[PDB]
Design a protein around this ligand. Structure first.
Ligand code: SF4
Lengths: 118, 49, 459, 205
């Protein structure tokens, strides 16, 4: 019932139109990447008049990791396990801009040598 | 490095096909009149700084 | 679509059974290389025409080096019906009909297929036909001899290659090629296994350089969108994070061309590199090296440029953490994991040989894979402008392609992926050719569990 | 100030040349997505290099920024070769500017670039969502709906000119002509950063 995420995605999609790639979701919720996949699926499931669809990355790998642009086709990933949905885009192309984000809360896997101020 | 490339392609006529000893013979070319040589002279004037 | 249905099917990983405010730290990385040695390839702090003295220094250093091995590590003179294999290098007594060990260096054909104050193309007429002929000349600095045989084209000893040749003499001018020599092995730096409580150690040689012109978004694509999240958020559920170690770029930090660039477009791509590296630095620690088209000396010993690759947000981390999370390292570096020594090359050192300066020695990934095998074996002068320093180029301690041998050499920016392993009498060496990122990436795990490499197609 | 009209110059470069790209007034193979045309762009904007044309574009932007308080609304007009009738009129604004106030505060570089990236991406969105029929035979011309201007008489009155800056200024007043003064109008999301209020819309026919 986590619609607390969904309206926050709704401003960034709509009231201004900069796309979320991943990092806004992890900044907002600090949910798991599997849970972020569930959330983006839920947004896709509860889509009402998306201006344009997202394209997914595919979890099934076979020594390949490809953003799908042959959406109907199955590009070398035939016996598919799963997909991780992200990069919901208003535009023709999928480009975000990239920025420093808060990560001390958000880092899923920390550094083998943690940084020291010294 | 472009001047050194020009100089070794100029100095290829004195080697048979070798390219690794081309650098010293390129550096020791001294014309009073060559349109890349003086630019290499001031290039090597810069690298001492 | 049914792609969403696959997510609907896979409800088993609700949250991957991670706490997710617990970071599970993966690697106990040792990195013995960082502090308690001088790096030979690195600059001189006091330091902070050249090439000529270096060439004789390589020739003499190899001459005493392989002078120890013509009969110690090769053919006994009791064979060949007592044909004398005594250590005469000059061609004055090579004309004696007994074949000796001809300890000399091949400079047969090295000039440029692609290109006018010096009138180059008129000179290059001599280049094309003679260079196309694959004939090999051996120079000990005392005279050329002809070479024919099968290993003329199969074994790519193109330039700077001190060998001892064995053939039935049969003419003063020419030999066949039955045998070559090598430098002696500088010895086995011990490969460890931490057998008690094995870490399942990190396994990484990922990035060949994120080649990033501002002029193209497609090179900007496949960084920061698939990567920085394969290290941490894009998941193989969950083993990809367990294999991945500490981030290794090799050269090519920002692609640009020098005659078209100015101040602010250099900082645009360098601050977006800062965005990438400060994005991935909480997740995975990084080791960075410039050297071919990112700013450099354009030499193999090349001073790595600190404080320019980073914005003010990221600038204070190298001040805060000295060499742990990131340090500036050169085009060669000996990354040692308590004796798993591995060597890096940004690629230009072999890519100029593989495409730019090659008219001969050609019988194309399986050809170019073995050029850096050769450059590993002889530890020799590959490129055309080496060591390229106004002060202290080489002080008889630090060859640009060094003398201490690694367990893996990294070379970069090839057309295709290539990863074999070959065993030599000294050690075992795995061949790593990580492709340039616009040529489909083919991004690689490296080593250190059973000395095994794993590429993944990033396209 | 000084930095704020640099931002206005980059924003108008992105706006103008992006309208030029999505109307196919120049061939798309000359365009490539980039961040550097003399400055730092917020987004990857498809820019053809063509140094006469980019000279024209930065010329026009340096013309519009030269007045900087008469203009309440910069705009882009779209004219066919077939008729002089307006095909689209893309709206932009110079309302409540920092530069007229000359307030030092506030820089907010990432925040102003954020709202600029939003307004650019909105321009992308409502430039693909109208279709592509008759994709060639379109041209470009500028229009400014401004509140209080007339500068074109400065060529006259027997003036004697000595400095290159006012040579440029006479070129600014020379290049601009008042014209003689609806069918559809579509919404566009503008930037709503504090000092730079750019309330940008679109018009159709
Ligand atoms: S400087 Fe000397 S070697 Fe170089 S191009 Fe001129 S004449 Fe030839």
């Amino acid at each position: 019932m986590d619609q607390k995420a969904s309206y926050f995605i709704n401003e960034k999609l709509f009231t201004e139109v900069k796309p979320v790639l991943f990092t806004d979701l992890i900044h907002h919720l600090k949910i798991g990447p599997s849970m972020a996949k569930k959330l983006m699926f839920d947004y896709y499931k509860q889509t009402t008049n998306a201006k344009y669809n997202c394209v997914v990355i595919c979890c099934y790998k076979d020594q390949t990791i490809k953003i799908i642009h042959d959406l109907s086709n199955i590009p070398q990933q035939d016996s598919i396990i799963d997909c991780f949905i992200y990069a919901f885009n208003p535009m023709d192309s999928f480009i975000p801009y990239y920025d420093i984000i808060d990560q001390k809360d958000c880092l899923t896997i920390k550094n083998s040598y943690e940084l020291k101020v010294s | 490095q472009t001047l050194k490339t020009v100089c070794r392609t100029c100095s290829y006529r004195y080697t048979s096909d070798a390219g690794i000893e081309n650098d010293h013979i390129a550096s020791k070319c001294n014309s009073y009149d060559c349109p890349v040589f003086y630019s290499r002279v001031k290039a090597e004037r810069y690298l001492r700084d | 679509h049914m792609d969403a249905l696959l997510t609907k099917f896979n409800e088993d990983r609700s949250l991957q059974d991670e706490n997710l405010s617990q970071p599970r730290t993966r690697v106990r990385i040792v990195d013995d290389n960082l502090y308690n040695k001088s790096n030979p390839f690195q600059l001189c702090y006091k330091k902070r025409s050249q090439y000529y003295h270096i060439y004789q220094y390589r020739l003499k250093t190899f001459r005493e080096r392989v002078l120890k091995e013509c009969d110690k590590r090769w053919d006994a003179g009791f064979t060949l019906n007592g044909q004398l294999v005594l250590k005469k290098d000059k061609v004055l007594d090579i004309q004696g009909n007994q074949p000796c060990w001809c300890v000399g260096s091949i400079y047969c054909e090295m000039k440029y297929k692609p290109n006018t104050y010096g009138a180059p193309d008129l000179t290059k007429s001599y280049t094309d036909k003679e260079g196309g002929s694959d004939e090999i000349m051996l120079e000990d600095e005392s005279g050329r001899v002809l070479l024919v045989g099968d290993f003329i084209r199969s074994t790519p000893f193109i330039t700077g290659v001190v060998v001892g040749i064995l053939g039935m003499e049969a003419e003063a001018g020419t030999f066949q090629v039955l045998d070559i020599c090598y430098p002696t092995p500088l010895p086995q730096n011990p490969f460890p296994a931490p057998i008690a409580t094995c870490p399942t150690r990190g396994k990484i040689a990922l990035v060949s350089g994120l080649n990033l012109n501002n002029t193209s978004p497609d090179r900007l694509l496949r960084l920061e969108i698939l990567r920085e999240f394969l290290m941490g958020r894009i998941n193989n559920k969950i083993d990809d994070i367990s294999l991945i170690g500490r981030l290794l770029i090799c050269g090519n930090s920002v692609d640009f061309d020098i005659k078209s660039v100015n101040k602010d477009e250099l900082m645009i791509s360098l601050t977006e590199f800062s965005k990438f590296l400060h994005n991935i630095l909480p997740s995975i620690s990084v080791d960075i090296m410039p050297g071919t088209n990112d700013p450099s000396d354009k030499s193999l010993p090349q001073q790595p440029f600190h404080k320019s690759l980073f914005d003010k947000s990221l600038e204070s981390y190298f001040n805060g953490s000295n060499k742990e999370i990131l340090n500036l390292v050169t085009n060669p570096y000996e990354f040692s994991y308590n004796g798993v020594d591995v060597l890096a090359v940004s690629g230009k050192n072999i890519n100029d040989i593989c495409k730019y300066v090659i008219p001969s020695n050609d019988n194309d990934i399986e050809h170019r894979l073995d050029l850096m095998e050769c450059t590993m074996k002889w530890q020799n002068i590959a490129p055309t402008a080496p060591d390229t320093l106004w002060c202290y180029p080489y002080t008889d301690k630090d060859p640009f392609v060094l003398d201490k041998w690694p367990h893996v050499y990294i070379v970069a920016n090839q057309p295709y992926f290539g990863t074999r392993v070959v065993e030599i009498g000294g050690k075992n060496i795995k061949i790593i050719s990580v492709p340039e990122f616009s040529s489909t990436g083919m991004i690689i795990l490296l080593d250190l569990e059973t000395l095994e490499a794993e590429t993944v197609k990033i396209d | 100030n000084r930095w704020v009209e640099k931002w206005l110059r980059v924003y108008l470069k992105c706006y103008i040349n992006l309208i030029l790209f999505y109307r196919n007034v120049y061939p798309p193979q000359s365009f490539d997505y980039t961040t550097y045309q003399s400055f730092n762009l917020p987004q990857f904007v498809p820019i053809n290099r063509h140094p006469a044309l980019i000279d024209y574009i930065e010329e026009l932007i340096l013309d519009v920024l030269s007045k900087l308080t008469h203009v309440y609304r910069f705009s882009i007009c779209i004219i066919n070769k077939k008729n002089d009738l307006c095909i689209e009129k893309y709206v932009l604004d110079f309302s409540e500017l920092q530069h007229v106030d000359k307030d030092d505060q506030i820089i907010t570089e990432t925040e102003v670039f954020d709202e600029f990236r939003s307004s650019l991406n909105s321009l992308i969105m409502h430039l693909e969502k109208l279709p592509k029929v008759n994709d060639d035979t379109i041209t470009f011309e500028a229009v400014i709906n401004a509140i209080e201007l007339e500068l074109g008489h400065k060529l006259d009155r027997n003036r004697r000119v000595d400095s290159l800056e006012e040579k440029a200024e006479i070129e600014r007043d020379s290049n601009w002509v008042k014209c003689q003064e609806k069918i559809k109008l579509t919404s566009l999301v503008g930037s709503d950063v504090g000092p730079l209020i750019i309330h940008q819309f679109s018009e159709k026919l």
